[PDB]
Structure 1
Amino acid sequence: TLQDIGVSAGINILSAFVFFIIFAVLRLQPFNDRVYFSKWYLKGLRSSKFLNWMPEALKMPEPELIDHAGLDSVVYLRIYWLGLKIFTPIAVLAWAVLVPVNWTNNTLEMAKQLRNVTSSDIDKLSVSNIPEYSMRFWTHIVMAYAFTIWTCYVLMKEYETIANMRLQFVASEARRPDQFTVLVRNVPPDADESVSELVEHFFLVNHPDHYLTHQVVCNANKLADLVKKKKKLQNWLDYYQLKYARNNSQRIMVKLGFLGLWGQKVDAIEHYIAEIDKISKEISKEREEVVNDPKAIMPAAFVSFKTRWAAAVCAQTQQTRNPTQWLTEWAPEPRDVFWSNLAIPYVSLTVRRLIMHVAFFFLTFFFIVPIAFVQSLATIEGIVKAAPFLKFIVDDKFMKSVIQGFLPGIALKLFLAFLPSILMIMSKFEGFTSISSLERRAAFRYYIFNLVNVFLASVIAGAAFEQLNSFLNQSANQIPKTIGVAIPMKATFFITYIMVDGWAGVAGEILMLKPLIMFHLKNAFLVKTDKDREEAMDPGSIGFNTGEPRIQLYFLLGLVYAPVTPMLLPFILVFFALAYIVYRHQIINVYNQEYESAAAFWPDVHGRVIAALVISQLLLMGLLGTKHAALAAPFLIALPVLTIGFHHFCKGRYEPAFIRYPLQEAMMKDTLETAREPNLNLKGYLQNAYVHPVFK
Structure 2
Amino acid sequence: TLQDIGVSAGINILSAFVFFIIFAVLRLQPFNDRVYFSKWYLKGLRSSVNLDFRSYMKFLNWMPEALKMPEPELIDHAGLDSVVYLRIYWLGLKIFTPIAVLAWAVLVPVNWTNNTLEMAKQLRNVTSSDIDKLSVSNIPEYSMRFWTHIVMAYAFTIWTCYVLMKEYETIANMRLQFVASEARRPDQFTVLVRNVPPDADESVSELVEHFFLVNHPDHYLTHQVVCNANKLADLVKKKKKLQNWLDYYQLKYARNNSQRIMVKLGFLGLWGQKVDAIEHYIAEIDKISKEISKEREEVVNDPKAIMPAAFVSFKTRWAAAVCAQTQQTRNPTQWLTEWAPEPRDVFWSNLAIPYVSLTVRRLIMHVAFFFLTFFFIVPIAFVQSLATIEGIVKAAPFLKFIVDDKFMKSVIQGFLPGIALKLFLAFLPSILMIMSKFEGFTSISSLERRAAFRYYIFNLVNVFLASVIAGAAFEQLNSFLNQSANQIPKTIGVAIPMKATFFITYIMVDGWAGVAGEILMLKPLIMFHLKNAFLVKTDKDREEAMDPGSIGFNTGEPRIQLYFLLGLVYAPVTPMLLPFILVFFALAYIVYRHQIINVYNQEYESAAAFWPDVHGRVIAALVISQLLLMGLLGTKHAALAAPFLIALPVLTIGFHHFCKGRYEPAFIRYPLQEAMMKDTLETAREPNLNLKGYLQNAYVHPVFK
Q: Provide TM-score, normalisation by structure 1.
A: 0.81
- Alpha carbons of 1:518 and 1:682: their partners in 2 closer, same or farther (altered >3 Å)? same
- Alpha carbons of 1:282 and 1:642: their partners in 2 closer, same or farther (altered >3 Å)? same
Work out the CA distance in 2 between the residues paired with 1:379 and 1:140.
Answer: 51
Work out the CA distance in 2 between the residues paired with 1:132 and 1:400.
Answer: 52
- Alpha carbons of 1:503 and 1:244: their partners in 2 closer, same or farther (altered >3 Å)? farther
Q: Which moved more, 1:192-201 or 1:490-499?
A: 490-499
Q: Which residue of 1 aligns with 2:53?
A: none
Deviations 1:421-473 (A, max 9, x none): 32222222222221211111111111111111111222112799999999999
Structure 2 alignment gaps of length 5 or more: 49-57
- Alpha carbons of 1:367 and 1:142: their partners in 2 closer, same or farther (altered >3 Å)? same
Q: 1:281 Cα deviation (Å)?
A: 11
Size of the aligned set, in residue pairs, is 696
Contact 1:186-1:325 at 8 Å conserved across structures: yes
Equivalent of 2:99 in 86, 90, 93: 90
Q: 1:302 Cα deviation (Å)?
A: 0.1
Q: 1:306 Cα deviation (Å)?
A: 0.2
Q: 1:77 Cα deviation (Å)?
A: 1.3
Q: Which moved more, 1:116-125 or 1:323-332?
A: 116-125
Structure 1 alignment gaps of length 5 or more: none
Q: 1:401 Cα deviation (Å)?
A: 21
Work out the CA distance in 2 between the residues paired with 1:369 and 1:267.
Answer: 59
- Alpha carbons of 1:29 and 1:197: their partners in 2 closer, same or farther (altered >3 Å)? farther
Contact 1:383-1:466 at 8 Å conserved across structures: no
Q: Pairwise CA RMSD of aligned residues?
A: 8.2
Q: 1:3 Cα deviation (Å)?
A: 7.0
Q: 1:262 Cα deviation (Å)?
A: 23
Contact 2:188-2:320 at 8 Å conserved across structures: yes
Contact 2:567-2:581 at 8 Å conserved across structures: yes
Q: Which moved more, 1:101-110 or 1:479-488?
A: 101-110
Work out the CA distance in 2 between the residues paired with 1:148 and 1:684.
Answer: 53
Work out the CA distance in 1 between the residues paired with 2:369 and 2:139.
Answer: 40
Deviations 1:191-227 (A, max 9, x none): 1212111111111101111111001111224643665
- Alpha carbons of 1:476 and 1:451: their partners in 2 closer, same or farther (altered >3 Å)? closer
Matches within 5 A, 1:296-307: 296-307=305-316
SS at match of 2:391: helix
Q: Which moved more, 1:536-545 or 1:166-175?
A: 536-545
Contact 2:42-2:598 at 8 Å conserved across structures: no
Q: Which moved more, 1:389-398 or 1:24-33?
A: 389-398
- Alpha carbons of 1:471 and 1:552: their partners in 2 closer, same or farther (altered >3 Å)? closer
Contact 2:139-2:146 at 8 Å conserved across structures: no
- Alpha carbons of 1:417 and 1:562: their partners in 2 closer, same or farther (altered >3 Å)? farther
Q: Which residue of 2 aligns with 1:634?
A: 643
SS at match of 1:27: coil
Q: 1:260 Cα deviation (Å)?
A: 27
Work out the CA distance in 1 between the residues paired with 2:384 and 2:2.
Answer: 18
Contact 2:494-2:635 at 8 Å conserved across structures: no
Work out the CA distance in 2 between the residues paired with 1:549 and 1:496.
Answer: 19
Equivalent of 1:607 in 592, 595, 616: 616
Contact 1:541-1:592 at 8 Å conserved across structures: yes
Deviations 1:564-612 (A, max 9, x none): 2111111211111101111111111211112221122111111111111
Contact 1:117-1:382 at 8 Å conserved across structures: no
Q: Which moved more, 1:182-191 or 1:96-105?
A: 96-105
- Alpha carbons of 1:186 and 1:294: their partners in 2 closer, same or farther (altered >3 Å)? same
Contact 1:409-1:496 at 8 Å conserved across structures: no
SS at match of 1:328: strand
- Alpha carbons of 1:92 and 1:416: their partners in 2 closer, same or farther (altered >3 Å)? farther
Q: 1:60 Cα deviation (Å)?
A: 0.8
Contact 1:22-1:511 at 8 Å conserved across structures: no
Work out the CA distance in 1 between the residues paired with 2:347 and 2:550.
Answer: 15
Q: 1:677 Cα deviation (Å)?
A: 0.7
- Alpha carbons of 1:256 and 1:389: their partners in 2 closer, same or farther (altered >3 Å)? closer
Work out the CA distance in 2 between the residues paired with 1:412 and 1:286.
Answer: 48
Deviations 1:164-188 (A, max 9, x none): 2222221111111000001011111
Q: Which residue of 2 aligns with 1:592?
A: 601
SS at match of 2:338: strand
Work out the CA distance in 2 between the residues paired with 1:132 and 1:378.
Answer: 50
Q: 1:21 Cα deviation (Å)?
A: 2.7
- Alpha carbons of 1:80 and 1:479: their partners in 2 closer, same or farther (altered >3 Å)? closer
Q: 1:90 Cα deviation (Å)?
A: 0.8
Q: Which residue of 2 aligns with 1:399?
A: 408
Contact 2:550-2:600 at 8 Å conserved across structures: yes
- Alpha carbons of 1:32 and 1:92: their partners in 2 closer, same or farther (altered >3 Å)? same
Equivalent of 2:272 in 239, 245, 263: 263
- Alpha carbons of 1:474 and 1:338: their partners in 2 closer, same or farther (altered >3 Å)? closer
Q: Which moved more, 1:376-385 or 1:440-449?
A: 376-385
Q: 1:13 Cα deviation (Å)?
A: 2.7
Q: 1:254 Cα deviation (Å)?
A: 20
Contact 2:548-2:601 at 8 Å conserved across structures: yes
- Alpha carbons of 1:669 and 1:282: their partners in 2 closer, same or farther (altered >3 Å)? closer
- Alpha carbons of 1:563 and 1:253: their partners in 2 closer, same or farther (altered >3 Å)? farther
- Alpha carbons of 1:202 and 1:591: their partners in 2 closer, same or farther (altered >3 Å)? same
- Alpha carbons of 1:383 and 1:245: their partners in 2 closer, same or farther (altered >3 Å)? closer
Q: 1:288 Cα deviation (Å)?
A: 7.3
Q: 1:190 Cα deviation (Å)?
A: 0.8
Deviations 1:674-696 (A, max 9, x none): 11111111001101111111121
Deviations 1:365-396 (A, max 9, x none): 34356999999999999999999999999999
- Alpha carbons of 1:44 and 1:496: their partners in 2 closer, same or farther (altered >3 Å)? same
Q: Which residue of 1 aligns with 2:263?
A: 254
Work out the CA distance in 2 between the residues paired with 1:463 and 1:292.
Answer: 57
- Alpha carbons of 1:163 and 1:563: their partners in 2 closer, same or farther (altered >3 Å)? same
Q: Which moved more, 1:315-324 or 1:398-407?
A: 398-407
- Alpha carbons of 1:206 and 1:534: their partners in 2 closer, same or farther (altered >3 Å)? closer
Q: 1:274 Cα deviation (Å)?
A: 14
Contact 2:531-2:538 at 8 Å conserved across structures: no
- Alpha carbons of 1:512 and 1:271: their partners in 2 closer, same or farther (altered >3 Å)? farther
Deviations 1:539-588 (A, max 9, x none): 22122111211111111111111112111111211111101111111111
SS at match of 1:391: coil
Deviations 1:645-676 (A, max 9, x none): 22222222222322322211111100110111
Work out the CA distance in 1 between the residues paired with 2:486 and 2:219.
Answer: 72
SS at match of 2:606: coil
Q: 1:7 Cα deviation (Å)?
A: 6.1
- Alpha carbons of 1:595 and 1:485: their partners in 2 closer, same or farther (altered >3 Å)? same
Contact 1:372-1:461 at 8 Å conserved across structures: no
If each structure's helix is expressed as a fraction of its own residues, which one has the higher value? 1
Q: 1:101 Cα deviation (Å)?
A: 3.5
- Alpha carbons of 1:592 and 1:484: their partners in 2 closer, same or farther (altered >3 Å)? closer
Contact 2:380-2:420 at 8 Å conserved across structures: no
Contact 1:560-1:620 at 8 Å conserved across structures: yes
- Alpha carbons of 1:366 and 1:207: their partners in 2 closer, same or farther (altered >3 Å)? same
Contact 1:219-1:297 at 8 Å conserved across structures: yes
Q: Does 1:152 find its partner at 2:136? A: no
SS at match of 1:117: helix
Deviations 1:605-625 (A, max 9, x none): 111111111111111112212
- Alpha carbons of 1:531 and 1:627: their partners in 2 closer, same or farther (altered >3 Å)? closer
Deviations 1:123-176 (A, max 9, x none): 623323333224211111111111111111111111111122222221111111
Q: Which residue of 1 aligns with 2:36?
A: 36
Q: Provide TM-score, normalisation by structure 2.
A: 0.80
Work out the CA distance in 2 between the residues paired with 1:481 and 1:362.
Answer: 26
SS at match of 1:297: coil
Deviations 1:292-330 (A, max 9, x none): 641111101100000000001111112221111111110
Work out the CA distance in 2 between the residues paired with 1:220 and 1:469.
Answer: 49
